[PDB]
Structures are given as C-alpha cells and as structure tokens.
Amino acid sequence: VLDFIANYFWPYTRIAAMLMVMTVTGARFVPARVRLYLGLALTFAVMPAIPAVPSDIALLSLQGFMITFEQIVIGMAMGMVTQFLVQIFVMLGQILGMQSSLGFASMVDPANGQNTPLLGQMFMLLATLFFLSSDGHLKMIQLVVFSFKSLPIGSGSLTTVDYRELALWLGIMFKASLAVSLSGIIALLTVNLSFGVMTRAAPQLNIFSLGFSFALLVGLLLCWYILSGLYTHYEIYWQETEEQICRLIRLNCENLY
Amino acid sequence: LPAMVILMTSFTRIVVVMSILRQAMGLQQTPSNQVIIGIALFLTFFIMAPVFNQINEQAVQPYLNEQISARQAFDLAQEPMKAFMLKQTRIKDLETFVEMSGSQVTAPEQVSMAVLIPAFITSELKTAFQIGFMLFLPFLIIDLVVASVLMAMGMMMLSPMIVSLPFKLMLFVLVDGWNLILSTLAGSFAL
Amino acid sequence: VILMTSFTRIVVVMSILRQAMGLQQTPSNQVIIGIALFLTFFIMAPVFNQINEQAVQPYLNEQISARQAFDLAQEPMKAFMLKQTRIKDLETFVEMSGSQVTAPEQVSMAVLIPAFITSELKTAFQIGFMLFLPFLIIDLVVASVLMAMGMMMLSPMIVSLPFKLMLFVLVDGWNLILSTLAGSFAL
Amino acid sequence: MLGFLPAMVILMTSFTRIVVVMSILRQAMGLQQTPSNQVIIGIALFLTFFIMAPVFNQINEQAVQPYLNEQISARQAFDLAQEPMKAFMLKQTRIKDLETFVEMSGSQVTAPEQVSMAVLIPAFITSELKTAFQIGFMLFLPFLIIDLVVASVLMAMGMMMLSPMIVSLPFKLMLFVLVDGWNLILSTLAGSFAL
Amino acid sequence: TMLGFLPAMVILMTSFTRIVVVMSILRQAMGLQQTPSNQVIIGIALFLTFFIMAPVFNQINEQAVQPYLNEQISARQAFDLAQEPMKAFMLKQTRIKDLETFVEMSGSQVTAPEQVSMAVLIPAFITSELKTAFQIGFMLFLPFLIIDLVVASVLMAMGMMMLSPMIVSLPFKLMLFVLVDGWNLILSTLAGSFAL
Amino acid sequence: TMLGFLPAMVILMTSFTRIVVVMSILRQAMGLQQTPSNQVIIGIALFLTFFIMAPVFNQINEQAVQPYLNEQISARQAFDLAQEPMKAFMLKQTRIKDLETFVEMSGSQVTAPEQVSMAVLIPAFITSELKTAFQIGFMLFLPFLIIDLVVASVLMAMGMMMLSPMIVSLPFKLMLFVLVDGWNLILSTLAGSFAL
Amino acid sequence: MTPEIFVELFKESLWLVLIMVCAIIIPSLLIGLVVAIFQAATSINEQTLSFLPRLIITLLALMFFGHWMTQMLMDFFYSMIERLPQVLY
Amino acid sequence: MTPEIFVELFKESLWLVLIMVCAIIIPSLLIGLVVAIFQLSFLPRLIITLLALMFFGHWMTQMLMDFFYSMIERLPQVLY
Amino acid sequence: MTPEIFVELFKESLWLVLIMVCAIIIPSLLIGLVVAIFQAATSINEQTLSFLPRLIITLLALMFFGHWMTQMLMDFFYSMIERLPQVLY
Amino acid sequence: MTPEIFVELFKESLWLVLIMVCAIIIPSLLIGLVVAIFQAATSINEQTLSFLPRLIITLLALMFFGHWMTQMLMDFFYSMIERLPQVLY
C-alpha cells in the first residue's frame, strides 16, 4: 500500500548518483548505507522543490531506463567536476613530492614498482576540508535542487558540446596545478642546479653520497611555503568549477549562491 | 529500512572517524568494516543513553500500558530526538535547508523532522571529516618523517607504509588513543 | 556494452599518457575513468542519434516488434565498428571461428566484437607511441644536457617532470590530443 | 538489528585483539593478503571458542540449559547471561578506562562490578584494542630488524632496486619458524587473559 | 555458503586461466602497469574463451538447454549429461604425465583416461595449463627483455647512467609490439595452442 | 549470525590453509605481481583439498550425509559422528610439541589425545599447519631468490644500476620453474606432505 | 572551522615534520659531506663506500633523538585533541 | 620442454642482444678512441650514436621482427 | 606502556640493527677501500671493479656469521615476549 | 625445524649464489682490468670505454656456462624438494 517510491525514484537517483562521486560523501570512509540513506533522506527534504516527474513513464519499461540512465549521467557529471577540483591539489601534492625525491620508486619504475601517495594524500585532506570549511557540499546540493528546475526530468540532458567541454577539464587540471605550484617548482629546480654546480666541482658526490638530502629538505620547505596562501587559488578555482556546473544545469548564473 | 533511526543518532560520525583512523595508519581491511560498525554501535548506545531514556521512561512503557494512540508515542518521541539534533546541527546548514525546502524561514525548534534529518547528517559529516582529518594529520607526520629518513640513507624501495606502522602504533598507544579519541567523541555531544 | 563503445581505446590512451608524464597514478584512476567515460559520449553521440532514430522512437511509437527492434538496434553499431577494424585482423578471427561469410556486415556480433577489440588496442598503441614521442624526447634532451654538464646529482627524471608539465600545458596539451581522439574516429 | 548482531556479539569476546594482532603480523611479513580475510577471521574465531570456553560453558549451563528446559527465558535468561560476560570482561579492562567511561556516562558507580553493560563494553573495547596495539608493536620489531638490515646490505653493494620485500621474505620466514612462531605467539595471545 | 567459492569454479572448468596468465605476464613484460590494462585483460581473455568454447558450450546447450524446454529430467542425467563434454575437452589439452602423477595420488586407478574422476583431472588440468602458459610466456617475453637490455646498455654506454632505462624503453617496446602486428598474432598463437 | 563465517570455518577445519599459503608465497616468489587470479589460487587449493581429504569426505557422506537421507535420526548422528574422523585426520598432522601448550592452557588435561576437545585440537591443528606451510615455503622459495641475487649482481657488474632487476629476471625464474616440471613436483609434495 | 585555521594547523605539522627530518638528516648530511671530501682528497672514487657511515650516524641519531622527537609529537597530538571542541563550533 | 631447447633459445636471444648493442656502440667506441688519442667527448659521442641509430634502425627492427616471428614459429613444437 | 619502556624497547632493536649491519658490512667496506687504494697505486679508474670482491666478502661473512646472527636475533625475539605480560599491564 | 638445518641449507643457497656469480663475473673483471691497464698505459681518461668489451665478456659467458648453470640450479631445487620431508618432520 502507498507505493510512493515510484513517484520520486528519478530525483532520488539523480541525487544519489551525484552523491556517489562527490568528493566528501562519495569518497571512502563512508559505508554505502550511509550515502544511500543520505540520498533517500534528501528527497524527502526537497520533495517540495521537485516538479512532478513526467507521468506515463513506468520504471519497468524501456522508456524509463533511457531517462534513468540520462539522469545517472547528469549525477556523475556534477560530482566528477568536484573530483577534478580536489585532484588539482592531489596533483600539486604528487608533483611536489616526486620533485622532492620522496616519491621515487615509481619515478624510476613506472611499472608495478612502488608508489608513495603521502604528500598527495595530505593535500587531498586540504581539498576535502576547503570544500568543507567553505561549505562546498551545501552549494553542491543546492545546485542539484535547482537542477530539477533547469535540467528537469524528462526534458533533455547534457548536449554533445557539454561533454567535450567537460573532458577538457584534464587540461584545466594540469594548468591549475602549474599555476599554483610554479613558484615552488622554479625554486626547487634552481636549487637542483646549485647541486649540479657543487657536484661538477668534484665528481665524487653521487646519489649515494648526499643523495636527496637537500632535495627532501627543500621539497618539504617549499611545500610548507606554498601552504601559506593556498586558500586564495582554491577560491579562484572554486568559481570555475561552480560556473561549470552552472553550465550543465544552465540556471542563469550571477543570481544567488 | 529501520537503520535510518540508528543513523539519525550520533552513529554516522563515529563510523566515519573510526574509518579515517583505520586508514590513517597503514591498515587496510584491518578490523573489518563490520568490526568498526560494531564499535560504533556500542559507542552510540553509550552516548545516546539519555535520549533513549527519555524515550523509554516517557513514551515506551506508557505505550506498553497503552492508554494512548500508537502514533502519539512517535509524536512524543519525535520531539526529544529532534531536540538532540538541534544541539548538533549547524545554523548555516539549517537555514540553507530551510531555503532549499521552499518553506518560509521559520523559527528553529519548529521545522519538521524531515528537514532536520539531512541537515543533521550533513553537519555530522562536516564535523567528522574535520575531527578525523585533524586526528589523521599526526599519523601522517610519522609517515612523512620515516619516508624522508629512508630516502636520506636512500634504499628507495623499503615501502614506508610498513616500516612506519610500528612507530604509528607505538605513538598511538603512548597517548592511549582510544581513551582520548573514543572519549572526545563522547564529550563532543552536549545534549 | 561499454566495450562495444570506444572507451576501451580511450582509457588505454589515457593511462599511456599518465605514465608518459612520469606522474604515476596521479590523475586518480577513478578520474581517468570519468574523463574517458565522458569522451565516449562526445564520440558516440552521432551514433546514438541514429540508434534513437532507427527503432527507439518507432518502437515507442509502436512501429516495430521487440525482437525486430533489438535486431535493428545492432545494425548501426556494426556499421560503425566495421570502419575501425582492420581487414587482416577481422579476417583472422572470422576464419578462426570457421564460419566464413561473404560480407563483413553479415558477420556475427560475438565474433566481430573480439576482432574489434584487438583492432582497437593496436590503433591505441599506434596513438600512444606518438604520445610518448615528445615526452621521451624531452627526457632524453634534458638528460643529455645534464650529462654534458655531467653533474649526476640531477636524476634527470625528477628534474625533467616539471619540464614535462611546463611543456604539456604550454602547447595547449589536452586540447590537441583530444582533437586526435575526435579525428581518430572518422565514422 | 540482525544486520549488526554478528558484530555486536563478537565484540563481547576477545575476538578483536586476536584479529588485530594477526593482521598486524600479516602485514609485518609484508605478505599481500596471503592469509585472506576468510583465513584470519577464521583462526581468530577459533581461538575465541578456545579461550571463551569457561564463559561459554557457564552461559550454556545457566542460560541455554534453562532455555532448553524452559525455566525462564528472554527476560531472566538474558539477564543471567549478562552476568558472566561482565565477570569476564571486567577482569580484563584497566581501571583508568573504566573510570573514564563511567564518569562520562554521568551515572556514578561505587562498586566497579555494578556498571551497566552499555557502559561496561565501550570501556572494554578501548582497553582491549590498546592492548592489541601494544602486543602488535611488541611482536613487530623483530621483523622490522630483519627488514632494515636486509634493506641496508643491498644498498651497501649498490643494488638500489630489488625490493627488500622480496629478498627479505626468506629471512623472516626462517626466523619465524626457528622461534616456533605460531606456537609462542598464539600462546601469549591466549595467556594474556585473566579467564 | 558457496557464494564466494563458486565464482572461481567456472573459470577453472574452462580454459580461461591460460589467456589471463599469459597476457598478464605480457602486461608486466611491456613494463606497463595499469589497473586499467589489468581489468581489460579479463575482458580480452573472457571473450577469447567465449570464442574458444563456442563448440563445447554450444554442444552442451544442444544437449541440456534446448532439451531444457520440456527439461524431461531433473539433476540426475541432466547434470551428468553436461559433466561429459567438459571432461572430453579438458583431456585434450592436459599432459599425460601430469594426469598420471595425480591419479596415483588419488589411488583410484582407471584403465581409461576417459573414465577418470573429475576431481583429479581438474587438479591435473590446472598444473598443465599453468605450465603451458609459463612456456608461452617465456616464449613471448624474450624480445622485450632484449629491448630492455639494449636500451639500458646504450644508455649506460653513452654515459647517461642515472637515467632510468624503464621510462624510455616503453616507446620502443610499443614500436616492436605494433610492428609485429601486436595482439593479432598473439591471440592467434593462443588460439593455435588449443588445438583440438 | 552463523551465516557469514561458515565459509571461513568449514575450510579451516580441513587441511586447506596450507596449500593456500604455500602457493601464495610462491606467487610472490616469482618476482611477479600475483598473476594467477586470487580465485585461481583458491580454486586450485579448493580442488587439491577435495582431492586430499577424500578419505574424510568419503566418510562424512557415507556415515553422516547419506544416512541422513532416510535421516534415521533427528539430526543427532552427524553432529557427533563426523567429528571423530576429522579429529583422527588432523591429529596425524598436529605436532605433539604444539599440542602440549594448547592442552595445558585449556586445563582439561587428558592422557588420550584423541579424547581432547575438538575446540582444543583445531587451534592446535592450525598453529601446526602454518608452521609446516612456512617451512615448505622457505624450502620452495630459495631457488627463486638465488636467481634474483645473481641477476642483480651481474647487472650491477656492468654498472646497470637502474635496470630494475625484477623485469629482466622474470624469464629466468619462469624458465627454471618450467624446467623442473614445477607444479607437478610442487603439488605432489604438498599432496605428499599430508602424510595420512 | 575556518579555512585559515586549517592551513595554520597544517603548516604547524609541516614545521614539525621539517624540524624532525633536519634533526635526523643533518648528521647524515655532514657525515656524507666529510666522507665525500675524504674521497676527493685522495681521488678515491667509490659510490657506495659512503653508505656505511651515513647509515651508522642515522642509527646513532635515532638513538639520540629518540625521546625528544616522541615527546614533541605527543605534545602536538595532545594540542590537536585540545582544539577539537572549537572545531565542532 | 627439454632444458636444452630452452638453453639454446636463450643463447640466441643473448646473441641478438650482443650483435645489436655492438652495432650501436662500436661507432661511439671508435670516435672516443680517436678523440682520446687526441686528448668534451660526450656530445660527439651522442651525435654518432644517433647517426648509427638512424642508419641501422631498419635492419635492427627487421632482425627483431624476424626473431619474434621465429619465436612464434617454434612455439607449438615446444608446447607439445 | 610508558614513554620510557617503549623508547628503551626501541633502542634495543636499533642496537641490534646497528651491530648486525656493521658486522656484515665492515668487511665489504674494508675490501672496497683496499681495492680503491690498489686502483690509486695503479692509476686505475674503474667504477664497477670493486663490486665482485665486495660481494664475495659480503656473502662469505653472511655464511661465517650465519649462526651467530640467527641466534642473536632469535634471543632478542624471545626477550620481546618475556616482557609482554609486564607491558600489557 | 632445527636452527642448524636452516642455517646450513641457507649456506647452500649462499654458496650457489657465490659460485654462479663468480663464474659469470670474474671474466668481466679480467676484461675491465686489462682495459683500464690499456687506458693507463695509453694515458686515456675514458669512463665508459670499458663497458663495451666488458658487456661483450659477460654476454659471452652467459652462453658459455648456460647449460652448466641451469643444471646446477635445477639439481639444487631437486635436492631441496628431496630433503624437504626430513625437515617437515
């Protein structure tokens, strides 16, 4: 009796699909039941702000499966951008590490070898805090709310030009990771050239005489330095990754949060 | 389907903090997600005891002595659980979900439970990912230190996610860890 | 079904690139799968248009039976794949299944797919070799400059990674390779 | 509640200590999940029935024997079963953790035997895992000694590659069998208890 | 209670293992570490095994599933019906020395290798598939190792000692792979190994 | 609650966990990311066990299961009859030196070892298995390490300091393992180490 | 609960890390330096000669700084646990 | 399957490695010998290595492809 | 359980590592050094010349010191367990 | 199972390593030595001159001693399996 779940399945699916990827909820550390009951609870809350789903579309019919996939796509799309956001800083971490010679086993051997995700694992904490300190996830959920009124159920999805712009984000990530870390990269390289001068002085100094000592030191030090004004860049890139989600669900930006 | 009730409590926070911890020090699939679900289901019974007391000694037993409508029991129990959450949810989360609900901005202690639940869980997740990542950070200091010391003498290969696990456990037990971590999580709930 | 798409080639090209940078597992293979999954829609979009037109709308307009619509659905897919497979490679497998056919269009699904995947891997490697070319060039030239200096505290890989980056993004990087993964599928 | 009762009842025992210890050991050997989860959660499950034999026997005689003969059940039998569990766990927790949780619970105690189960357990788990980590670190070091010396002889000759985690497996296994390994280890993990 | 073990029987019953093992040796051979390539290995070997057991799977279908319209029978000469063609098939790819060192351990000696207990052929079938697979792997590996040796050697000779001859050997490992038409031969050779 | 742990116990009462650890030590010994499937390891071990414990399963089904078809008794025979054959099995592999501790710490000291409680023999059986398994491992492991040491040394001899002697040395190990019939000798020794 | 307080909290930890790593390595750095100078003095060109003394000095320093480091890090973890309530609010 | 068919199959791969690397390095060897007879000597040593590369590359890849094909050929006899 | 019993328990293993490593390596360092001295006395500039003589001793010592090493480390592992009950409480 | 069977079995593997390595490498030492002597007599200060003839030698030896080596190691593995049951119990 009261088969309501049929009435609100699609919005819930869009919500939870956005959730299964979003950098805070859809990460690890959170068992799938938590995320599932979180998504199912959000619908009850936004139940007012959801237009009537297009009737006559039974779930157990091809017509329903097409659109259900057409919403899972939007959901994955919204979160994957935030994923790119935090991965910007992950790459910052892994660049500054592998430049410090800290991560070295996978730089000599790209094969199975050995990876050291430590500095990157730390900067991911930052990016998952910045997205939380400034309440990113709230804005991200509000965007999904507005989505039911900009990219409504049963009325279109992302277009081909949207996907292409979205898959460009990998270039954006490399660009951002350099825009942030250029100061430290250049300094570390100059210090490595200072090394090279002092070693050209005498060919005795080798990888197993003073191997990586100054490298480790300066790589950590310039990382601490980059840490100083790191929130500013995150604020800038949050604007881009926010307008981008505004591009998907058109929504006419510059109106609210 | 009933597991929402337990997830209405301070359960999702302890689950998350413990999962960040298990992954903080090398350990993966050490004490199984079932084990941490257990430890959380116990710390929750320890924390929410006043709430369950308000429920039992005020609506439960008088319902076994019914003299009341069955839904009246939920109605009188919907209130104390609410009051517990309202001491935990952030104000920003509450007002933002009032906006998103479409309902007018009404006074707190007045919004329905349905808006309280996700506003509660998101505030809990915020608090938990902060607490854990600030407990996480130390266990990462050791990792960086030992990996740097390795790379110093070199050796390039001794996976520093195990050569550091002794130090991690020694340093986690030197502070007694759980009598500080499992306590602060119980002291982080004024209700 | 995801294998019937192009994503198979796409992700391999992705990971080839990742290891070319010397930044292993840095784009978080979850993210790589995401971007590669999104390209697949930017590539397959014209195909999916015809797929919807042929029977999807008519079936929903009740203009074809279920099994007949399903049989019609594979046709544009077969046509699309037949332009990517190589003659020799398709030949090997159509023979190795024994049952020869006159027209490659009449080849069965479960036998075209395997020849499709190997034909896709081969061309994916043909792409990836081009991808490694500039990065290997950069590694070699920086190592050679260092050796001319002969300082040996350089370990040219770790000092070369910043150059790999400042010369991937400086040349607009992902936009060019993307254009090749868009032009590679001349349908 | 059925989705948790397996994890609820397994925690009343010393299951967790054995699990964590054998896990730390499995990673000490460097072995990449060679004794899989279905191996460790089986061996540490058996050692529970080996250790919890007295508690289980008292349970059966005082709860399951009354339940099969149906003297009184599900109200009194559950309580009678609650007793020996407290008797067992209470003899293993430290004082400090228990006073911590009992002052946190707000309900004051005068006789440590008279803490409620819901406050007894959460003090037991914290005083168990802490012991588990102590044991684990105390078993780990000898293996670490093996790694760091191996991982140094290699660099001494120049072999920067050839991960010691492949060349130092035989040393660790020879050591572990020469000290009889699973004999001494699993005995102390069985002798640590007051039961 | 077999929700975990059963998924492993189906691949061992068939000859799914050899392709996975050889292609996974080859994945390391290319020096290419990819969890993506590691995943797609399963797809490649899986559809290869489809194409390979199409005769035997189709025969088993004709013997059981097509009769399983009226089904005429339940689990007595229906299960033991399908038990036969798989035993016929595996027997043509195992060695004989392997099977006789196993039947002697079972002690249940049979005059006919065709009337052999299933529970001893499969343990003899796997030790045979793995041996054949390692043979194929040591066959396919050598050219790439030669590439690696030449690469490291020229790098060391020209003086570039510190450069890692593992990030630079990969382009030539791909060149030599594609010049030989890559998988087209390899899988073919694999299909050649299962000569029935 | 006795639903998700049965697969972890019904296997461990058996002589199963030895072959697992042995082949898993080998799987790393090859200088080689796993490449049998984990399912391959568990399946070849599952069948080796169904092959080895045949005297015991042939007694379980014959004395307890098939008698439980007419069922002849309200589920009491099998709960009490199936325990003696397995106890007599394990007791031949359990060292007495290891059992001495497990009995004196259980308290119920019995002169007749077969009269030991099952819950005391089983944990004595496990701690006796892993010791045997590690011994067999350290036996089977050393050759694959001789290869690696000699390979790394000859590589360092030319200065090839970066060649990563885990790619170049895989063909040599796989060659050695093929020459000696490999698994045939191995999976017979494990079959032969269960002296029963 | 502010972005700046998090970055401050992390720069603290990085400072801890850096002072620890200097404390440990600088002896290794100086000993590698002097052994390399002794190498270049008599033109003794050996690569891994300098791995014995450097490792020895690192082990000796681990013995030496064994207590100060753990005391420092424990103080830090305590301060971390002190700051948690204000992080809640 | 026999040790000797595996020992010879390995000896030939070694022969390949030898004849391949020498074709590349001998020119560097000779130029270094002459310049040291005169005696800086690395950048030239790199020029001539690239020259030998571009010169003998076709023959090298042809020889290796031949070896790969022959490897494939002698396979089914070794399998059984 | 104390910040001192875990620092001393640490110093023990560090001392073992130190003595094991030096016992193994000092012959290798000495033979490499005399090889380099011979190089200097013969104007020999070879890089991997002193490898084989150095690995020869690095192995001969590991067989000559086999039993002593495995006995020392075994005795240590033993002492890591006698004190286990005293530290568990 | 006894501390001496596992140390002597270990001496056996180390002896294998030593004899294989010296078989393969000593000719490389010889060629490197004579090449360095050639440089010194000719006053030639070249670093990687030696590597070409030295690699020639070690690749010739891998084919000169191939069957003998793979026979030795095979026999060793065989003796390992043979003596296993006397160590298992």
DSSP per-residue string spanning chain C: -TTTSSHHHHHHHHHHHHHHTT-TTTTTHHHHHHHHHHHHHHHHHHHHHHHIIIIIHHHHTT-S-HHHHHHHHHHHHHHHHHTTS-HHHHHHHHHHTS---S-GGGS-HHHHHHHHHHHHHHHHHHHHHHHHHHHHHHHHHHHHHHHHHT--S--HHHHHHHHHHHTTTTTTTHHHHHHHHHHS---
Contact J46, J39 (CB under 8 A): yes
Q: Which chains touch F (3 or more CB pairs under 8 A)?
A: A, D, E, H, I, J
Cβ-defined contact of E28 to F170 (cutoff 8 Å): yes
Residues of A in contact with E31 (CB under 8 A): 110-111
Q: Beta-carbon neighbour count of residue I42 at 10 Å?
A: 13
Q: Which chains touch D (3 or more CB pairs under 8 A)?
A: A, B, F, G, I, J
Cβ-defined contact of F164 to E162 (cutoff 8 Å): no
CA I8 to each of CA A3, I1, J55: distance values in angstroms, whole numbers, following the listed order: 67, 11, 50
CA H55 to each of CA E174, F141, H23: distance values in angstroms, whole numbers, following the listed order: 21, 46, 10
CA J82 to each of CA B155, F137, H24, J76: distance values in angstroms, whole numbers, following the listed order: 37, 14, 47, 10
Residue A111, chain F, CB below 8 Å: the answer is: yes
Cβ-defined contact of E166 to F170 (cutoff 8 Å): no
Beta-strand runs (E) in chain B: none
Cβ-defined contact of E176 to H68 (cutoff 8 Å): yes
Tokens (6 digits) for A48: 């007012």
How many separate domains does chain C show? Answer: 1
For testing contact with chain D, the best of B169, B172, B184, B185 (most D CBs within 10 A): B169
DSSP single-letter state for residue A59 = S
- Specify the resolution in Å: 4.1
Q: CA–CA separation, E183 vs C92, rounded Å?
A: 11
Method of determination is cryo-EM
Tokens (6 digits) for A138: 């709230």
Domains in chain I: boundaries:
1-89
Residues of E in contact with J48 (CB under 8 A): 156-159
Residues of H in contact with C148 (CB under 8 A): 42-43
In a domain, A144, yes or no: yes
Cβ-defined contact of J55 to H21 (cutoff 8 Å): yes
Residue type, B57: E
Residues of D in contact with J10 (CB under 8 A): 174
Contact J80, H20 (CB under 8 A): no
| Residues G65, G67, G70, G74, CA torsion sign | negative
In a domain, F1, yes or no: no
Residue A110, chain E, CB below 8 Å: the answer is: yes
Residues of C in contact with A62 (CB under 8 A): 56, 59-60
Residues of J in contact with D183 (CB under 8 A): none
Residue D153, chain A, CB below 8 Å: the answer is: no
Cβ-defined contact of J10 to D174 (cutoff 8 Å): yes
Cβ-defined contact of I36 to G47 (cutoff 8 Å): no
Cβ-defined contact of G67 to I7 (cutoff 8 Å): yes
Touching A: B residues 59-98, CB under 8 Å? 92-93, 96-97
Q: How far is B44 from chain I, CA to nearest CA, in Å?
A: 28
Nearest CA in chain H to J63: H11
For testing contact with chain H, the best of C92, C145, C147 (most H CBs within 10 A): C147
Residue D75, chain B, CB below 8 Å: the answer is: no
**Residue among A104, J25, E12, B183 at smallest CA distance from F43:** E12
Cβ-defined contact of D174 to J1 (cutoff 8 Å): no
Q: Beta-carbon neighbour count of residue E19 at 10 Å?
A: 27
Q: Beta-carbon neighbour count of residue H2 at 10 Å?
A: 9
In a domain, A255, yes or no: no
Nearest CA in chain A to E30: A111
Residue H36, chain J, CB below 8 Å: the answer is: yes
Report the SS3 class of residue J51: helix
Contact I24, I65 (CB under 8 A): yes
Kind plus residue range of the DSSP H or E element containing A16: helix A9-19
Contact C154, A192 (CB under 8 A): yes
Residue E162, chain J, CB below 8 Å: the answer is: no
Contact H14, E144 (CB under 8 A): no
Residues of A in contact with G61 (CB under 8 A): none
Distance, C-alpha J10 to centroid of its chain: 17
CA F5 to each of CA C94, F57, G39: distance values in angstroms, whole numbers, following the listed order: 48, 21, 63
Q: CA torsion angle for E23, E25, E31, E36 (degrees, to 10)?
A: 50
CA-angle at D23, arms to D18 and D29, nearest 5°? 125
Residues of A in contact with F167 (CB under 8 A): 111
Cβ-defined contact of D156 to I25 (cutoff 8 Å): yes
Report the SS3 class of residue D193: coil
Nearest CA in chain A to D163: A113
Report the SS3 class of residue F11: coil
Distance, C-alpha I19 to centroid of its chain: 5
Residues of I in contact with D144 (CB under 8 A): 13
Q: How far is C89 from chain A, CA to nearest CA, in Å?
A: 29
Asked whether at least 3 C-beta pairs link C and B within 8 Å, the reply is no
Tokens (6 digits) for D5: 């009762």
Q: CA–CA separation, J21 vs J44, rounded Å?
A: 30
Residue D178, chain I, CB below 8 Å: the answer is: yes
Contact H12, E139 (CB under 8 A): no
Cβ-defined contact of A90 to C154 (cutoff 8 Å): no
Cβ-defined contact of F141 to D38 (cutoff 8 Å): no
Residues of G in contact with I36 (CB under 8 A): 44-46, 49
For testing contact with chain D, the best of B43, B44, B47, B182 (most D CBs within 10 A): B182
Q: CA–CA separation, J72 vs A37, rounded Å?
A: 65
Q: What are the two backbone dihedrals, phi and then psi, of residue F76, each rounded to the nearest 5 degrees?
A: -110, -35
Note down the domain range covering E74: 6-140+182-193
Q: Which chains touch A (3 or more CB pairs under 8 A)?
A: B, C, D, E, F, G
**Residue among G46, H51, G45, H46 at smallest CA distance from C143:** H46
Residues of B in contact with I6 (CB under 8 A): 170, 174
Cβ-defined contact of A113 to E33 (cutoff 8 Å): yes
Residue G79, chain I, CB below 8 Å: the answer is: no
Cβ-defined contact of D145 to I28 (cutoff 8 Å): no
Q: CA–CA separation, A176 vs C169, rounded Å?
A: 10
Q: CA–CA separation, B127 vs G9, rounded Å?
A: 16
Q: How far is F160 from chain J, CA to nearest CA, in Å?
A: 10
Exposure string of C112-136, with b = 16+ CB inside 10 Å and e = fewer, is bbbbbbbbbbbbbbebbbebbeebb
Q: CA torsion angle for A56, A62, A65, A70 (degrees, to 10)?
A: -90
Q: How far is B17 from chain G, CA to nearest CA, in Å?
A: 13
> Both ends of chain J: CA-CA distance in Å?
8
Q: What is the CA radius of gyration of chain I?
A: 19
Tokens (6 digits) for E132: 């054949």
Q: CA–CA separation, B128 vs J20, rounded Å?
A: 59
Cβ-defined contact of F159 to I48 (cutoff 8 Å): yes
Q: What are the two backbone dihedrals, phi and then psi, of residue E108, each rounded to the nearest 5 degrees?
A: -80, 85
Q: How far is G15 from chain D, CA to nearest CA, in Å?
A: 27
Nearest CA in chain A to G40: A204
